[PDB]
């Protein structure tokens, strides 16, 4: 176990068939979680569970380019629960990131940042106890 925020290096960036697995537990009064796949200061892929946006739960995904956020992609399917252990898996494919939570498909996010081999850090933050962050090739 690790204390957030945590940065996982992705040396040489990401590549298709890379599977990133984040294990932890959602804190009991959680408000937000964020994963940030970074290319320098740019955020290629921001994955942001919000537990109380206008008294709703929503997943917001986006990209930050030149310090500006782009167009949000939102999902109301919300597989997280306060207080519960989770597993987020991010599978890099040629054209998108695919996200599964607790072994159930959640969403896909098309690559806006094209230079996968420059997406060299994953930031993990928010209202979690982080157990582990690792990757393998499938
Ligand atoms: C309030 O800032 C969030 C921003 N954010 C979250 C965190 C964050 C920080 C720490 C933790 Cl621990 C954590 F879990 C976080 F999520 N940091 N930045 C992102 O989520 C962005 C995703 O579009 O939306 C907000 C900013 C925003 C949105 N938009 C629009 C595109 C314009 O109309 C919608 N303009 N600016």
UniProtKB/Swiss-Prot annotation:
Keywords per UniProt: Acetylation, Cytoplasm, Differentiation, Disulfide bond, IgE-binding protein, Immunity, Innate immunity, Lectin, mRNA processing, mRNA splicing, Nucleus, Phosphoprotein, Repeat, Secreted, Spliceosome
UniProt GO BP: eosinophil chemotaxis; epithelial cell differentiation; innate immune response; macrophage chemotaxis; monocyte chemotaxis; mononuclear cell migration; mRNA processing; negative regulation of endocytosis
Sections of the chain in a coiled coil: none
Residues binding a beta-D-galactoside, per UniProt: 69-75
Top-level taxon: Eukaryota
Main location: cytoplasm
One GO CC term on file: cytosol
Keyword Aminoacyl-tRNA synthetase in annotation: no
Motif mapping: Nuclear export signal: 114-129
Keyword Disulfide bond: yes
Positions where Phosphoserine occurs in the chain: 76
UniProt tissue specificity: A major expression is found in the colonic epithelium. It is also abundant in the activated macrophages. Expressed in fetal membranes.
Galectin domain mapped to chain residues: 6-136
Protein's cellular compartments: Cytoplasm; Nucleus; Secreted
GO MF assignments: carbohydrate binding; chemoattractant activity; disaccharide binding; IgE binding; laminin binding; molecular condensate scaffold activity; protein phosphatase binding; protein phosphatase inhibitor activity
Assembly description: Probably forms homo- or heterodimers. Interacts with DMBT1. Interacts with CD6 and ALCAM. Forms a complex with the ITGA3, ITGB1 and CSPG4. Interacts with LGALS3BP, LYPD3, ZFTRAF1 and UACA. Interacts with TRIM16; this interaction mediates autophagy of damage endomembranes. Interacts with cargo receptor TMED10; the interaction mediates the translocation from the cytoplasm into the ERGIC (endoplasmic reticulum-Golgi intermediate compartment) and thereby secretion.
Protein task: Galactose-specific lectin which binds IgE. May mediate with the alpha-3, beta-1 integrin the stimulation by CSPG4 of endothelial cells migration. Together with DMBT1, required for terminal differentiation of columnar epithelial cells during early embryogenesis. In the nucleus: acts as a pre-mRNA splicing factor. Involved in acute inflammatory responses including neutrophil activation and adhesion, chemoattraction of monocytes macrophages, opsonization of apoptotic neutrophils, and activation of mast cells.
Protein's UniProt name: Galectin-3
Organism per entry: Homo sapiens (Human)
Residue numbers of the full-length protein present here: 113 to 250 of 250
């Amino acid at each position: 176990p690790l204390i957030v925020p945590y940065n996982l290096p992705l040396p040489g960036g990401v590549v298709p068939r890379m599977l990133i697995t984040i294990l932890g537990t959602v804190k009991p009064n959680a408000n937000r979680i964020a994963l940030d796949f970074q290319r320098g200061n740019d955020v290629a892929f921001h994955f942001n569970p919000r537990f109380n946006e206008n008294n709703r739960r929503v997943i917001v995904c986006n990209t930050k380019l030149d310090n500006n956020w782009g167009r949000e992609e939102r999902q109301s399917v919300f597989p997280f629960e306060s207080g519960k252990p989770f597993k987020i898996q991010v599978l890099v494919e040629p054209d998108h990131f695919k996200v599964a939570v607790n072994d159930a498909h959640l969403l896909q996010y098309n690559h806006r940042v094209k230079k996968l081999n420059e997406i060299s850090k994953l930031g993990i933050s928010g209202d979690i106890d982080l157990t582990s962050a690792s990757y393998t090739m499938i």
